[PDB]
Write a protein that binds this ligand. Structure first.
Ligand code: D9F
Length: 358
């Protein structure tokens, strides 16, 4: 009944296992659904951070989702737009008065959500001597102390600092910390069971780590150099990331649970980048593609097997969530690996979508 060629599930498992057997990556897991029903899910390999014997990789293993945290930040922003507390055309200076200066005074909330605010990829912690970057106002005043790379609406430039600002805006608008809002109005509201900004001590043994750095960050109470965890730092599982993708595919609903109105989701999944604008990723020119309100619309169509309209987001880790609304199809995966490799992160997407039938 899922209308999927299970011959491609065999290829997907052998593809991941072949890289595991060759030592390219330690573990891998995935979960795919059609019509809201999961029909295939597998966890492969073993993990260790360097201080442990290799433990099994399971489907409920907690793993940092990295850049996928931005998707949680995008939902939280739009919830406040639905409540009328925020507006996408609001200048950031109205909420953060430190932005009332040339260059920064032109930035609107819409520019941050779509990576068009002209911000660089990341702020520099080495040049921030004597400044507590974990403090909200000290981080903002040091941010506006650093020049902007481009003007607003000049180019698409992936920026970590953009979503850090949004997390601050959520905090100043709601009156609670960013992590408190997301945990209450998204994590607990969507019924996510294995998702935490900071994993409790009784569950840290079930968190997948693959490097010394990840073990150290797992035992910490803050982000190393950001006032919040809006751009990165969330820990989750396959099913919880799957629930988030399915909520988007159903336009804000997940059975009895509702996070966004359907008209809001249709706007988030809508291309928001003006045509002909250049795209940059980490100091390199990237191919022009659709981008919504924090949600990626590329890759889709073209030489890929994902139908046009497939929305997505990847995360450093690596991980990823892909959902094809035209096929009622969702695919999420964890591939913990030191450096990015398209053969492990992107290539399996060809194997998966090749299995869809009728
Ligand atoms: C499909 C692409 C992925 C290709 C980019 C990765 C290249 C690998 C190594 C490079 O040195 C850069 C890398 O280390 C730095 C990664 C920073 C954060 C990445 C995540 O936020 C995923 C973002 C995906 C967005 C667009 C895209 O287009 O993702």
């Amino acid at each position: 009944n899922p209308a999927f060629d299970m011959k491609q599930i065999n290829a997907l498992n052998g593809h991941y296992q072949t890289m595991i057997d060759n030592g390219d990556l330690q573990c891998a897991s995935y979960m795919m659904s059609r019509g809201g029903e999961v029909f295939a899910a597998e966890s492969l390999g073993e993990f260790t951070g360097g201080q442990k014997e290799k433990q099994t990789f399971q489907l409920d293993t907690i793993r940092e989702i990295g850049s996928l945290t931005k998707v949680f930040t995008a939902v939280a922003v739009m919830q406040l737009v639905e409540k009328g507390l925020l507006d996408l055309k609001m200048p950031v200076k109205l909420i953060l008065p430190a932005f009332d200066k040339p260059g920064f005074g032109e930035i609107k909330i819409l520019h941050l959500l779509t990576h068009t605010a002209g911000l660089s990829f990341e702020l520099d912690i080495q040049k921030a001597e004597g400044i507590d970057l974990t403090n909200e106002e000290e981080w903002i005043n040091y941010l506006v102390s650093t020049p902007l790379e481009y003007g607003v609406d000049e180019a698409w430039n992936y920026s970590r600092t953009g979503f850090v600002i949004l997390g601050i805006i959520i905090s100043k608008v709601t009156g609670v910390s960013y992590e408190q809002y997301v945990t209450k109005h998204i994590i607990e509201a969507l019924g996510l069971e294995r998702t935490y900004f900071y994993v409790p001590d009784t569950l840290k043994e079930e968190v997948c780590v693959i490097s010394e750095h990840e073990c150290v960050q797992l035992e910490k109470s803050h982000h190393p150099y950001f006032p919040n965890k809006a751009t990165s730092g969330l820990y989750s599982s396959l099913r919880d990331i799957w629930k988030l993708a399915e909520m988007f595919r159903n336009k804000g609903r997940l059975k009895d649970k509702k996070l966004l109105g359907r008209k809001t989701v249709e706007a988030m999944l809508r291309n928001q980048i003006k045509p002909g604008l250049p795209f940059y990723f980490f100091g390199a020119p990237r191919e022009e593609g659709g981008f919504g309100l924090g949600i990626n619309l590329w890759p889709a169509g073209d030489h890929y097997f994902m139908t046009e309209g497939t929305f997505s987001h990847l995360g450093m880790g690596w991980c990823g969530m892909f959902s094809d609304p035209a096929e009622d199809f969702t695919y999420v995966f964890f591939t913990p690996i030191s450096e990015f490799h398209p053969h492990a992160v992107l290539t399996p997407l060809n194997i998966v979508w090749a299995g869809i039938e009728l």
